[PDB]
């Protein structure tokens, strides 16, 4: 009575998942206009029934949001037992706060809206800001990239007893001294004021750029200069999560990174074709984890300091 | 007191209603982000006003709907008094029943939505079903195309008094016997066998005016033409009061016998007009500022249907 | 632990239902004033149950509608695991738009009522407008009668191959369309503007008169009149909900019918003595089979072309 | 810019309401239909205006009920600026505990009822329980007999100074230790063996006024007169300010000893006032009026308690 | 899969609960900033179980409440399945009206706050008007010391056949005839219009002030001079709810109680030990009864008129 | 039309408020019970009012938000028009997320405590996280101490061209750097290690100021300012917009190398300034009138920030 689904042909991670719990992918009619006004038909019965549906790799958030949104819709009124959106890379979550100006807060929106379709449980990886958490009163699972991160660092590095972690801005510091002790090394910290200036110990030391996602990458490319520039003897980038838009691909190739490590929060296989200093962690087996002990009433908690 | 903003590129709708109304639309800052992740922000405050969005008309729904949603909540964190969406073309209004399948009732997510975005009002013009307005607990000004359609078919087409309004599909029937009765004339009706098009009522040597509340690549009211040719109608007009005009639709009507395709102004066509001549356009743009100054005002909203 | 309850001394129907699954209906002691103030009590726990209440054929909607509403709340809040309303005939559902007058929209009252007394669930009849579902934010199954009605025809009209299904407004074209193309046979309809006019082929066919509900049948009897007039063979009238309230009965006993067929979704005993033009369809097997199935988290839409 | 309107035929009430605030009842359209299935119409634009039903005196206590609700939808939903429920008389006001069995809490049924159908403040006269009131998340304005009641006892009851209050149940000892603490007189207490009456406080050649909120049959009041007879009182009165009057009532009234039995305009007597003399009205529109002009006006409604 | 949790440091009555269903009170971890700014920590996993948290009976009723709230809230999202808040004696409840003044009905605000802290379920005992429960949508159980009351009384009072129960207030009416009834016997009221007026019969039997609940006790020891100056042999205090703050325990020595008897839904430990006049009813078993019943879907009304 | 009310014994604030608006703080009665039981009656009419509650300072927290709820109730029944808290420290603030435990977001359960008792808006002081506005559904105004921080640094320290803003902890960056950016100046961080404290930026030959938004025991800021000097600091400073100041921190104050404290009005210091020579007030009244008054005249508040 557990019932995995995937928004659209982006099945990928979705089917990895799956595929993880001994399950198919549940059927789905997707019919879809010129405007992008989508159709969906859930088809088979999800009546008394666990349903999970994890949120598309696309591209499109807007058609990827109200995708999901539609699909829980469909479940919810089909007498679903439970409906738990999956959902490994949250949008919006960057608009999480005012900020001095007469903006949304477009993530409590995309939490509401999540909400009144019909969510009964989030299961996402790395809100951009943690407080996400209370954007919602059905509960959250915010699982964590830094096992599988840690696990990456101690692996593929082989100096990461004498590494330095570095935030690519000034929220980030928290995300990086928690690395930092944790592997008993030094953090650094970079802020944009368009200068940027670093303070802590980076000086013929590996420097490993530690954030939660990379977009246009911009920001990422300059740290990297600055780091050289500052006396590290190479430059590392993990992200949780890798958006790549615009020219992030042309920007990471020209680029001074020994490697861009993200996770599969969001596809990345056509992103790797064109860019060989991208590798890719699989976090499939985290996000089915959580899943299956979601489904049977089991600690997620040990999903936080281990990698099944 | 009173402020109009538009949603999205498609500022031509908006501009005409702040016009009638005298007032410019309010600024707007719309940054557009990496994976079409839009932002939104109000660049003027409308701390307890009286605010009005209407809808964006740039084709991508998903994007407009999440631009106007962020829009509605932006006004109502920034203490807007009152935040109304004017929302010409309904999105998603089709999806208003499960229709014998597994499927969602899209229609009831929008209005939703819209209220947890924090809508206090509609106004729209010919819901798909009547119903929707049943789908939110707040206010619904449903506003009706029917008065300037009328207008139209007896300013514009000779043989109106032995005309027939015809629906292109079953569903349609109750709009066209309205239209039909206001006239005094005939109405005819298209079944697609569920194949092959069945036409009920007569048609035979009188002018055939399709009537549908809406239509996208046009591939139905194309084939009901057709039919209506085959059984003998005069010549066949096509009366829209949502032309989304997808897919083939541009030359899939120029192909077609079609004497004229008449729209109204709830989704820009002016890009479609020049690529289609038979199409003409009955603006609505008066009735959706007579509204929203009628709202404002708390005076009747109720004569304009 | 599934519990099945009656509204009122109009038991007859759930007490169908109930002998359909095995069961007895449960206690309920109901004291009346004067004035109609309606007192409940639950004569046993219903404590961690799955509850049906069957909402009563007794004719006073009002009182029908609070005592179901008045029912619901007491299960509730005497810890039912889940309370669903089977409402074989939907109230108020012609109330179910504003229609360009200043009308309430009765039909979004009542579910919102239904929704706040605590419905958790609605099981239904051929709701008058299938929109209506989107009243509500809980799960409603709407049932069609269209299966036993398609299968009453074939089995009850020799000439069924080659009669015209009409529909006796416009509203209910998609209805008789729908059994039209699945009998493989015409439609007809009428449309009153006082006048009646009908499109469509009825010369010398039966012709079946389908509709959701019929009232006082006013509009039924002239239909038949209409399609006689049309050189109609003779004419037949299948309504799911068989109202029949004021002169109804006068009007049918006079009318040119060959019969009036409803279902038992109303009590039709009292009717059907003073009336030998009716015959009744019962759907008690549709309900018990559609609470079954939802108790059970098994599949209900098999419900919608299966006559169990 | 406020609006009253009456529901259904018992429009004495709202009439004399509407007349202390110097307007005309709104016009509304009530057809009734099969099964008692209620219609209702508002006959005038209500959009942007303060509105406020008053309850109908029918006797059918859910037909009453439904129309009232169905009436504040109807306004909601076509933008009344607010809609007040005026309830002189709560319905299912009894019902509101469980009471040692699985029963309903039915007035809180009711409050949810009327406050999704969007009533946004109430407006009523002695609930059977002051804690109905937190019932509601909106605004409620419980309004006193007692002031008006304590003036008819002075006027009316020459030996009003040596008279007892007594209360028909033990359940109801607050509301007349309460008037009898403002009139400086005694009180006393009936209880039915839970069989015979128990009757605790003192009675003899004094005047007994029996004071409960409501009587319907008056098949406990009726009881409880004999015994206040059987104890020696001199004459025994009937104050009620909710008088239902159904079944044997009327009769029930007259057959007992009562000097008189007073109740209020919350439901209409005229009917019962000729089969029953002995009924007195005390009118309390002017104190519902006076809520009504104070809650749209912003003044104070604390005073009139 | 059945989960108590309790309140602070006064486990107390939640380890009595704990006990008699074979449980030990799950893990939690609070501290407490200066400000009494309250931190929880849950030190388990309570995903997918049935969670009962106990009110403290600590004394600071704010602090307490709080509490509670925000261990609610950490069990919901941490998915508990369901949480009950068993309140032993429910706060704010003498503030349920708003009586002739501008006042709050707290009692419904803290309905509400139970409410949105995501409460699912209450356990209460003798709530100080009935009411109460209507404050909630939420299912209540509002459990009796009735029965318990009734059987102390049979034991320990001889002359219970011929004694007099009386209430303290105008309000109690109810309360005492109830078992006045039950036990066959009388009655009497007492009223303060400062002066008190006793109704009924008191002259040489035993008179039992039976109260919800007792503060300062200036009024039950007001009461009790007014019965023996009536000619009542002996005056005894019942009491569910013993909250004896300020001079209670100053005003309860010098008084001519015979005894004063309270359940311990509030800690009475320390009061004791200074009063020899107070005497408790256990009523732990009563709230264990609730929650197993509650748990299995057992009927909870028979610990109505039972003592388990 | 405008009503100040303030909670529990503290004043001060609300005095300060009351007067730049030209107003008297409204009558409110407050009787403290048993075991802390709270009860407040709103001692005048709110009905049609827009009323302002500004919390109390009494120290403890939980007894002052129960009282602040009670208040924000007992104005909403009683029909005040509009209730806004005026929370400058907002409560529990620091429970904002889980945090890698099974933790209560606190913050978030008092928003929604906040919500149910009927708060139509917020306006509060420098919250812990910006996040927490996304806490609400309803608008919520969240000031700035920071332009008056500026002011008093460029106002009182010399040699602030060359100072460096440091920050306690390593969540704090963010608004250590905008402070640097603001002034063109440095800035550096603390981190203690998860122990001894590891700093990073220059901190050698300058003036250190210490920023952050609240300071409790102090036991932070107090082991931050050793290291400071540590590492060469001339002298350091300590800037908190809102001083809890509890158990040790008064002497632990004192016992430390400061040159000065500073804090906001936020919460009373009257009690630990004649204890604590070395602290100072930045008083921030005049941003809580200014926003109550642009808040009730609906205008900007934004340039408040």
């Known amino acids: 009575?557990?019932?995995?689904?995937?928004?659209?042909?982006?099945?990928?991670?979705?089917?990895?998942?799956?595929?993880?719990?001994?399950?198919?992918?549940?059927?789905?009619?997707?019919?879809?206009?010129?405007?992008?006004?989508?159709?969906?038909?859930?088809?088979?019965?999800?009546?008394?029934?666990?349903?999970?549906?994890?949120?598309?790799?696309?591209?499109?958030?807007?058609?990827?949001?109200?995708?999901?949104?539609?699909?829980?819709?469909?479940?919810?009124?089909?007498?679903?037992?439970?409906?738990?959106?999956?959902?490994?890379?949250?949008?919006?979550?960057?608009?999480?706060?005012?900020?001095?100006?007469?903006?949304?807060?477009?993530?409590?929106?995309?939490?509401?809206?999540?909400?009144?379709?019909?969510?009964?449980?989030?299961?996402?990886?790395?809100?951009?800001?943690?407080?996400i958490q209370g954007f919602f009163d059905i509960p959250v699972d915010n699982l964590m990239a830094e096992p599988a991160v840690l696990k990456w660092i101690r692996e593929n590095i082989s100096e990461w007893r004498n590494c330095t972690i570095v935030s690519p801005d000034a929220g980030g510091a928290k995300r990086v001294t928690s690395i930092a002790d944790r592997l008993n090394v030094d953090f650094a910290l970079i802020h944009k004021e368009d200068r940027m200036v670093l303070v802590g110990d980076v000086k013929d030391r590996v420097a490993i750029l530690v954030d939660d996602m990379a977009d246009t990458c911009g920001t990422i490319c300059h740290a990297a200069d600055k780091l050289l520039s500052a006396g590290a003897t190479r430059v590392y980038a993990i992200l949780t999560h890798g958006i790549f838009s615009g020219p992030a691909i042309s920007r990471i190739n020209n680029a001074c990174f020994e490697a861009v490590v993200v996770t599969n929060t969001i596809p990345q296989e056509d992103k790797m074709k064109h860019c060989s200093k991208i590798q890719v962690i699989d976090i499939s087996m985290i996000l089915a984890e959580a899943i299956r002990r979601t489904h049977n009433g089991e600690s997620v908690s040990y999903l936080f300091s281990h990698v099944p």
Chains 1, 3, 5 share one sequence.
Not at 24 to 45: A, D, H, M, R, Y
Not at 56 to 73: A, F, K, R, V
Request: glycine share 6%; hydrophobic share 40%.
């Open 1 to 131: 009575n557990i019932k995995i689904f995937s928004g659209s042909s982006h099945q990928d991670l979705s089917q990895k998942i799956a595929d993880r719990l001994g399950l198919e992918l549940g059927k789905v009619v997707t019919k879809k206009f010129s405007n992008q006004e989508t159709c969906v038909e859930i088809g088979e019965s999800v009546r008394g029934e666990d349903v999970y549906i994890v949120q598309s790799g696309c591209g499109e958030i807007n058609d990827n949001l109200m995708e999901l949104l539609i699909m829980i819709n469909a479940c919810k009124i089909a007498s679903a037992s439970r409906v738990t959106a999956v959902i490994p890379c949250f949008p919006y979550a960057r608009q999480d706060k005012k900020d001095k100006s007469r903006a949304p807060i477009s993530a409590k929106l995309v939490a509401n809206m999540l909400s009144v379709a019909g969510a009964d449980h989030i299961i996402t990886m790395d809100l951009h800001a943690s407080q």
